[PDB]
Amino acid sequence: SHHWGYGKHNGPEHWHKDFPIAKGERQSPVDIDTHTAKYDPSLKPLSVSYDQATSLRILNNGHAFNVEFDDSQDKAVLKGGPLDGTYRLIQFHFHWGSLDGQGSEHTVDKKKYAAELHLVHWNTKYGDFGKAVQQPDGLAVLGIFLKVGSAKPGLQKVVDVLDSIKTKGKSADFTNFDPRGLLPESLDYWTYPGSLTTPPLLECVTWIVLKEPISVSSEQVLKFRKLNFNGEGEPEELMVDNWRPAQPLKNRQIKASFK
Ligand SMILES: CC(=O)NCCc1ccc(S(N)(=O)=O)cc1
Ligand SMILES: CC(=O)NCCc1ccc(S(N)(=O)=O)cc1
Ligand SMILES: [Cl-]
Ligand SMILES: [Zn+2]
């Protein structure tokens, strides 16, 4: 059974024993060296089209919480930039720290942010998410950094429901949530080929990491940190530090959409 996690006994340094691609050639996350990233005029405009996004449910899966979408039609899609074709939004989730000084997966000139949002999309040419993750261009994940400062009003409905999904396996109805409230003003980004950042660590992702962070309040991220990795009735293990550290860049280039 799956027994990977974020603890000393089952965390990222152990994953390779059950998921040997952990030591692969295109693993994520990575440190983004902003001086070495090169502007690419070939990149087409990024198109985030969430007007018809249809959220359904929020789930504590024991690793993070996912806000799930109806992906049975092209209701919410990502296109353009480095992408060929249409990628459909399936879910978003976050990674975050025990303290404001850590929590992000990607880093920017080695800087760690308090958290990182991942909007996960699958390439419609593969029909379903399960098939998409077996393809090198199966997924596009839009990553957005969170820093602690002013509150993000568009996040508060998420924070408000966390009380109801404290433990692993709990879910709650979560309809009519607009993910556009989680974006920064600018769509300026970095992009590179990588992987899922949790087991199974599949090398199927085109990463698109926005340069501009969003600000959330200390009180908002403190509520993330009250979640539990454990199930109901088990010893409490706060859901904190659910991030994988930066992995070797190997033979990759990070491209910038700007400057
Ligand atoms: C729950 C616990 O700590 N189990 C220890 C054994 C255990 C550690 C790591 C993994 S892996 N390679 O999938 O990350 C599986 C099992
Ligand atoms: C069945 C299956 O492979 N599910 C993978 C779920 C999964 C989706 C996205 C990510 S991340 N943090 O890279 O955005 C990790 C895991
Ligand atoms: Cl794959
Ligand atoms: Zn993630």
- DSSP line for the chain: -----SSTTTSTTTGGGT-GGGGSSS-S--EE-TTT-EE-TTPPPEEEE-TT--EEEEEE-SSSEEEEE--SSSSSEEEETT--S-EEEEEEEEEE-SSTT---SSEETTBPPSEEEEEEEEEGGGSSHHHHTTSTTSEEEEEEEEEESS--GGGHHHHHHGGGG-STT-EEE--S--GGGG--S---EEEEEE--SSTT--S-EEEEEESSPEEE-HHHHHHHTT-BSSPTTSPP-B-----PPP----S---EES--
Q: Is the CB of 21 under 6 A from ligand 2?
A: no
Q: What is the resolution of this structure in A?
A: 1.0
Cα(228) to centroid of ligand 1, in Å? 18
Nearest CA owner, ligand 1 atom 16: 3
Instruction: Give the structural domain span for 127.
Output: 1-259
Q: Is the CB of 133 under 6 A from ligand 2?
A: yes
Nearest CA owner, ligand 2 atom 13: 196
Is 5 in contact with 63 (CB distance < 8 Å)?
Answer: yes
For ligand 1, pick from 1, 2, 3 the residue to mutate: most ligand atoms within 8 Å of CB: 3
Is 197 annotated as ligand-binding?
A: yes
Residues in Cβ contact with 56 at an 8 Å cutoff, skipping those fewer than 6 apart = 68, 69, 70, 173, 174, 175
- Euclidean distance between CA atoms 166 and 238, whole angstroms: 10
Q: How distant is the alpha carbon of residue 64 from its chain centre? A: 10
Residues in Cβ contact with 161 at an 8 Å cutoff, skipping those fewer than 6 apart = 58, 172, 174
User: Phi first, then psi: what are they for 219, rounded to 5°?
Assistant: -65, -35
The total domain count for the chain is 1
- Euclidean distance between CA atoms 57 and 158, whole angstroms: 11
Is 16 annotated as ligand-binding?
A: no
Catalytic residue, from 14, 35, 63, 121: name it: 63
For ligand 2, pick from 198, 202, 203 the residue to mutate: most ligand atoms within 8 Å of CB: 198
User: Phi first, then psi: what are they for 142, rounded to 5°?
Assistant: -90, 115
Is 9 annotated as ligand-binding?
A: no
Residue 12 in tokens: 């990222």
CATH of the domain at 212: 3.10.200.10
- Euclidean distance between CA atoms 180 and 22, whole angstroms: 32
Peptide linkage before 29 cis (omega within 30 of 0): yes
- Euclidean distance between CA atoms 99 and 240, whole angstroms: 9
Q: Is 3 a catalytic residue?
A: no
Technique behind this structure? X-ray
For residue 22, the one-letter residue type is A
Nearest CA owner, ligand 2 atom 14: 118
- Euclidean distance between CA atoms 60 and 167, whole angstroms: 6
